[PDB]
């Protein structure tokens with residue numbers, strides 16, 4: 001009984017084509033990028049992936065930003081707790097605010 | 100259905116690292132446009148044909 | 150940004166309505182597995198590498214750099230002391246060489 005706007009668009013020769021890459025395949029790309037980053041650091045961006053523990057990867061990042069790696073290795077639990085709390089805050093913000 | 104790529108699994112462990120022992124030198128080619136054709140249109144002659 | 154790998158050089162060439170960049174880059178090729186640890190206990194001290202990775206070939210521990218396998222004996226010149234052994238997770242027990250000991254043993 002109620003005509004649709006998409007039906008009115010399609011009845012006058014205007015059509016929307018589907019994208020070539022579907023959302024499951026985009027999610028597969030992001031999953032591959034996440035797994036490569038977690039299990040190798042930057043080494044999967046220059047060639048074959050080299051495995052490394054994530055504590056050593058975060059120590060590489062800390063030495064990159066100019067902080068000696070003993071700061072990580074003596075505050076690893078605190079840094080992991082801060083990262084988990086920040087991830088939870090991102091979760092709560094995206095669950096609450098839609099803007 | 101298209102293939103995204105070959106499936107791989109990184110052999111991750113909390114006390115194992117992989118270090119390269121050799122290397123290679125790769126020279127790649129990248130092409131970038133810079134300019135194009137500088138056209139000019141005689142407006143009156145194109146519209147009216149003198 | 151300029152070639153897949155670690156950038157070394159780029160060479161420009163002309164082209165009809167364009168430019169062609171030849172990016173010379175470094176790519177690591179032949180890989181090897183190793184057993185690794187963040188720090189080393191030595192007399193209650195926690196030795197950390199100054200630059201490189203603590204690795205082990207099964208029996209002995211050496212220190213290398215990250216992008217190329219070049220093992221060296223762990224001394225006090227390429228390591229630094231920070232804290233004690235009771236904090237770092239994954240520490241291992243090994244000796245650390247001192248170059249001053251054969252000089253003081255004269």
Ligand SMILES: *[C@@H]1O[C@H](CO)[C@@H](O[C@@H]2O[C@H](CO)[C@@H](O)[C@H](O)[C@H]2NC(C)=O)[C@H](O)[C@H]1NC(C)=O
Pocket residue numbers: 120121122123179
């Ligand atoms: C590192 O790789 C290079 C090539 O990528 C190796 O060089 C080759 O070695 C073989 C060994 O017999 C020679 O037959 C080839 O002629 C060499 N190629 C070139 C271009 O010189 C090199 O041996 C490798 N190094 C190690 C330690 O494995």
Ligand SMILES: *[C@@H]1O[C@H](CO)[C@@H](O[C@@H]2O[C@H](CO)[C@@H](O)[C@H](O)[C@H]2NC(C)=O)[C@H](O)[C@H]1NC(C)=O
Pocket residue numbers: 206207208209
């Ligand atoms: C780990 O590397 C060290 C240093 O190369 C090896 O120690 C020597 O190995 C050679 C064999 O190539 C022996 O001839 C020497 O007698 C060894 N020296 C000492 C002080 O042990 C060690 O064998 C390697 N461990 C492995 C391969 O498991």
Ligand SMILES: *[C@@H]1O[C@H](CO)[C@@H](O)[C@H](O)[C@H]1NC(C)=O
Pocket residue numbers: 110117180181182
């Ligand atoms: C390292 O060990 C893993 C697990 O045994 C193995 O799959 C892999 O081929 C080894 N070598 C490299 C270079 O990762």
Ligand SMILES: *[C@@H]1O[C@H](CO)[C@@H](O)[C@H](O)[C@H]1NC(C)=O
Pocket residue numbers: 113114239
């Ligand atoms: C690595 O993890 C396994 C289980 O996840 C654990 O049994 C092992 O003790 C860990 N190794 C270190 C050095 O903590």
Ligand SMILES: *[C@@H]1O[C@H](CO)[C@@H](O)[C@H](O)[C@H]1NC(C)=O
Pocket residue numbers: 190240241242
């Ligand atoms: C290292 O040595 C100390 C004292 O000799 C000991 O308490 C500790 O358990 C040892 N750790 C390992 C991993 O052998």
